[PDB]
Amino acid sequence: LTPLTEKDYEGLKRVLRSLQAHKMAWPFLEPVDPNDAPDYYGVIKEPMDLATMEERVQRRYYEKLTEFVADMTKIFDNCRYYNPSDSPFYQCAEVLESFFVQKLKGFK
């Protein structure tokens, strides 16, 4: 996908902030605390979270949209692999990803 422009980055900031503000997003705001998730970091080999993505956005880490979508998608894949499908954490990923899709389409 095409190189991110400066205006692109403003839209990414906006998408990121919308996700950070969502009621269901609290489990993903910061790196998982291993006290809150037993053996999380033995299970999950590529952790990701919204504070880590915000750092990357601020530093202009992303060069194409697909890299941004990749990190976001890691957040939901991680949660759904680590937790069972009836968990409330799993549902939090269901809700937030569909919101991300809605916002991503708006971004393009």
Ligand SMILES: CN(C)CCCn1ccc2cc(-c3nc(S(C)(=O)=O)nc4[nH]ccc34)ccc21
């Ligand atoms: C520091 N702590 C002592 C107080 C803060 C409370 N708190 C803040 C975020 C958060 C996330 C989980 C969690 N997150 C996920 S995740 C990212 O995969 O959706 N899966 C899980 N399974 C079981 C638990 C759990 C649990 C508690 C949490």
